[PDB]
Ligand binder design. Structure first.
Ligand code: HBD
Ligand code: HBD
Length: 328
């Protein structure tokens, strides 16, 4: 009869109760600013959906970041704009300062606050035990905020976390894959970067929720505490699941796919094999041992679960003994 349905265990009906104006991004009307207020300085990067530039707001002389949307992006731009406006002011959420029409591309350009020329992947393999804990807690603030607001990020990775290490300031960026959670809705599984893709995405389970971001955060943590970039290093999306299975075991994988009445892609029969769950202590060595504690291991264990429903939520994660040492 097909897959068994699933719902988020928290913030289930936040959008259902809200006026349509909140989540119906298609019907959102954009208030355009002055493109001439911003002077492009240097290109930072280019992807499939945008080109990001460092800029100067010539009115106040402040450094800003301009994200010029590619035309590929059509009316998915609307979703990002709405999400960024809904989440503005939220803890560690990138602040959207303006929306201008780019003269060259003839597409919207999103103007953000400038954090630093530094991402989390530039720093994260170099942090102390205390800093891992500190920055993980800052990330959780952003995640609980967007989840509480009916939004799932769907692209949590070190590259999407902008840090000003000197000022101990953090921002969750690139809401281009973000979506409104609607209970019972089937979503596109082609979201997030390969190494941070949850087992739900890899086994083609479309009724996923906020807990997807929690798996992605677990991938980040594992990578930080064990000094392994990335932690689950798949050659592609199939080998990605095999890499996970080599650590968590194939038995809990079969229990997961059984519970949700999911049919695994036949391609997995030849490559998945049989694996016992590995104890987290197996990944400990003299080079990462100062970052590993029984608290770190128990916390990681409660994020990296196949069953998306059995993962800690962002709020439960903030309550964890792992964060008791972080000054609050
Ligand atoms: N697609 C995107 O929005 C994007 C922008 C900059 C990158 O460096 C990578 C990706
Ligand atoms: N601080 C930065 O370099 C930065 C990068 C990308 C953003 O979308 C926002 C800010």
């Amino acid at each position: 009869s097909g897959p068994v349905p699933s719902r988020a265990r928290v913030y289930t009906d936040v959008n259902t109760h809200r006026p349509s104006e909140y989540w119906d991004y298609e019907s959102h009307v954009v208030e355009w600013g002055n493109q001439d207020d911003y002077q492009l300085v240097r290109k930072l990067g280019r992807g499939k959906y945008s080109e990001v530039f460092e800029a100067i707001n010539i009115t106040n002389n402040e450094k800003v970041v301009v994200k010029i949307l590619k035309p590929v992006a059509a009316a998915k731009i609307k979703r990002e704009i709405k999400i960024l406006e809904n989440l503005r002011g939220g803890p560690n959420i990138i602040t959207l300062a303006d929306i201008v029409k780019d003269p060259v591309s003839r597409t919207p350009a999103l103007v953000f606050e400038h954090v630093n020329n530094t991402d989390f992947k530039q720093l994260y393999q170099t942090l102390t035990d205390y800093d891992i804990r500190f920055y993980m807690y800052e990330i959780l603030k952003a995640l609980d905020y967007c989840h509480s607001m009916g939004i799932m990020h769907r692209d949590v990775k070190p590259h999407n976390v902008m840090i000003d290490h000197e000022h101990r300031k953090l921002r969750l960026i690139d809401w281009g894959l973000a979506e409104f959670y609607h209970p019972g809705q089937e979503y596109n599984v082609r979201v997030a970067s390969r190494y941070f893709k949850g087992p739900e995405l890899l086994v083609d389970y479309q009724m996923y929720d906020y807990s997807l971001d929690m798996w992605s955060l677990g991938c980040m943590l594992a990578s930080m505490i064990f000094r392994k970039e990335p932690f689950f290093h798949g050659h592609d999306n199939y080998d990605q699941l095999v890499r996970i299975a080599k650590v968590l075991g194939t038995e809990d994988l079969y229990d997961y796919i059984d519970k949700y009445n999911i049919e695994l892609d036949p391609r997995f029969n030849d490559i998945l094999g049989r694996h016992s769950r590995k104890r987290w202590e197996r990944f400990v060595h003299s080079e990462n041992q100062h970052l590993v504690s029984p608290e770190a291991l128990d916390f990681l264990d409660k994020l990296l679960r196949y069953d998306h429903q059995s993962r800690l939520t962002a709020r439960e994660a903030m309550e964890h003994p792992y964060f008791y040492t972080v000054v609050k």
